Amino acid sequence: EWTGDYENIGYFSHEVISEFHVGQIDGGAYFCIKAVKADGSRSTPLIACSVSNESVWAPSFKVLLEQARYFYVTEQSVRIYYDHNVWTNQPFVNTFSTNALVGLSSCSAATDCFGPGKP
Amino acid sequence: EWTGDYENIGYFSHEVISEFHVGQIDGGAYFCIKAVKADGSRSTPLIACSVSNESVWAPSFKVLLEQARYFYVTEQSVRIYYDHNVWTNQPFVNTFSTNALVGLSSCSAATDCFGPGKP
Amino acid sequence: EWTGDYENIGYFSHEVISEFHVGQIDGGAYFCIKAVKADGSRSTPLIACSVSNESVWAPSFKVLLEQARYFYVTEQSVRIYYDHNVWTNQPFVNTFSTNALVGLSSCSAATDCFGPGKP
Amino acid sequence: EWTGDYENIGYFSHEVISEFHVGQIDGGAYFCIKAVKADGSRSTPLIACSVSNESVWAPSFKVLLEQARYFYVTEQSVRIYYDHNVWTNQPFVNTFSTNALVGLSSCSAATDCFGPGKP
Amino acid sequence: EWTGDYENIGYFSHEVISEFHVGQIDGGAYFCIKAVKADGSRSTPLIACSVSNESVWAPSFKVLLEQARYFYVTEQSVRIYYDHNVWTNQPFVNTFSTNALVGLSSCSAATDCFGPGKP
Amino acid sequence: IDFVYRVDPNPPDVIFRDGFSLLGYNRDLQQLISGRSCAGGSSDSRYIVTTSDINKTYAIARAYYSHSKFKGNLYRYKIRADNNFYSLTPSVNYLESQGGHFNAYEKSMIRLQSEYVSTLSILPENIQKAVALVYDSSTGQIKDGTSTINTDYVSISSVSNPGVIPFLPEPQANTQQRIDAFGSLISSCFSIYSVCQTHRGQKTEVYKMPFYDARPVIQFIISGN
């Protein structure tokens, strides 16, 4: 399992991080993202959360937190990866999404982004 | 225990972090945020303090700390989640309210404040 | 060990961190601040050190270090809470006062300073 | 091991970090940077990665990550050191590189680069 | 052992950090800085390094980095402290100097530097 | 919100005769915080930027007096805010409403720099206080010297307009640029040479400033550093 697995780990191309949530879930801390389309197109917002003590995406929680804050202070176009069907806490899945934040790119063009993608 | 529990946790929306105290209590660092409504002013200022090594919300201390600083240096209308009636040290209470700090969700104007909410 | 013990520890309000020293004493990192009044009124400055392995204020070192930097980078009004007889190293007490940085509260305008205060 | 070992650790000078990426490969997290020469003469960009738990250069992960973030936000012309033939994960090498980020030395002029260099 | 034991640790006042450097030597992630006089009358620069895993000034690394980085992003006259003849690695002491960064004051030009000068 | 304070190294007999005026025609708002129209770039601002708090004036004085190359004096000038005095907050969100891109780096320096911008030459009729800022060799802290006071002030007691800046051009999308702050995170519109300082032929030849990039520093303070 890796951030670049195009079959399992999907991405959402050029997006900008609009909102940012931090909180405490059972056991530990967590944060959530509400990235929307950078160009302003109508798309379903990519709500992706990372929990400091849940799933296999816990060891990369601190790096992802700092880099999400960096790409939130700088409203860059970012290719946000996310593992789907990760969170099982039902109240967590009602207010947020099962998408688990696993990677956060730095799209600087309109045709390609840094990081792995589907061939 | 969860930030968006909406039963034990209350929240105040559209409240910019105005003042930021930092200190040490009983052997652990702590930080309190005083926030007032960003759009004009109403009600009473909300004082919410997070103490490390104390309360069940200790693990989310640092994650909130560097986030509150972010919401302090970058004045942002945020949605502050607090756990009322958690602090018992009366000298601590007569200065800062009983509220803790459990969530800090960025919000954009009066439209779609991020983070968990109530029906 | 609260930074609200007006009987044991004092505080200087509406100061600004003018000069910032960092270093290592006795095998542990430390930082000292030179806080002067945000005017020309005061004559002698306030020297408020903080060591990361000495005395009861060590746990709040890293938390204060980031806050003091914010008040050094942004030379803004701040309430500095200090003790009186913490440091015993003779060269250290010669260079820097026995004061220990125990708290740091942002002072908004000149009407009040957040945090504990003598009534 | 050292970034100044020019016999094995190569480098490219005057390359502004153009693209950033963060994720996790296997257990620990990783971050990759794409750098193009600020002069624009070079065509093939440099792609330097760093994994927090895989390479020999793991202990320098967080510090190099912070330095990369600062050189990325400021867009300084920075000399970049990299080790060759480090990654063995085929999905990883075919996506970014076989290069490990090992040193981020700043360059304050068009002909003044600090840090180790070939004699 | 203290930054200010002027019989052992030397210092240079009103020096601007010219160029930064980060890397990794042995198991620690050293960082080096090149400093020149703010006035511009100096002839040779001073190279100061703070290897993370070695020398008695190792615990100060994490506080001497973020401070120096600041004194790099804002070119500001500071008083840099250094312990001569600390490093042993010959390739390290040919490319860089043999003195270790131990402390970083903050000068207001003229002759006012906050630290243990004692000339 | 009123009586904004501006630092200029000129004796009162010059400023109270030939006051602050526009140094150019760039009326855009994004480049004002970025310091592109203020002594760091094109330097053609249509706005004169003044602080509403006394503390930032001492910050400016300490920043300028602590480089060993600022040969000269300094003076805090009190200006009565007129209708042509707009706070920087209720002119950014509006630009953000129509499609502006004011990121956290730009948004974090209006709170730091209590900026009030005048879209008109600051005539001498608005200046009231001229307090000399002396850098005494003892204790090295800025002290208020002689306070020049004259009857040029006109009692209107007007307040700074809290609306949007009229005729403000279309907001610039994206363009994550330099912010150019000097001293201790002071936006480089408060620098002397961000004003129209040409009264005589060789009037004021002081060293301009070294401007650094502020947004790495804002990243330094907001992050765990």
Residue numbers in the entry:
A (entry chain G), B (entry chain F), C (entry chain E), D (entry chain C), E (entry chain D): 1 to 119
F (entry chain B): 6 to 230
Question: Anything the authors wrote about it?
Answer:
The DiaT genomic islet encodes two distinct B subunits, PltBd1 and PltBd2, which exhibit unique functional roles. The holotoxin consists of a pentameric B subunit arrangement supporting a single PltA subunit, with the amphipathic C-terminal tail of PltA extending into the central pore formed by the B subunits.
To validate the structural insights from the cryo-EM map of the endogenously expressed DiaT holotoxin, we recombinantly expressed PltBd1 homopentameric holotoxin, PltBd2 homopentameric holotoxin, and PltBd1/PltBd2 heteropentameric holotoxin in E. coli. Cryo-EM analysis resolved these structures at resolutions of 3.05 Å, 2.61 Å, and 2.94 Å, respectively. Pore radius measurements confirmed that the PltBd1 homopentamer exhibits the smallest pore radius with significant distortion, while the PltBd2 homopentamer displays a larger and straighter pore. This interaction is weaker in the PltBd1 homopentamer due to the shorter side chain of Val73 in PltBd1. All holotoxins demonstrated cytotoxic activity, but the PltBd2 homopentamer exhibited the highest potency, approximately threefold greater than the PltBd1/PltBd2 heteropentameric toxin (DiaT) and nearly 75-fold greater than the PltBd1 homopentamer. Individual complementation with either pltBd1 or pltBd2 led to the assembly of holotoxins with homopentameric B subunits, yet neither restored the cytotoxicity of S. diarizonae. However, only PltBd1 displayed substantial binding to Neu5Gc-terminated glycans.
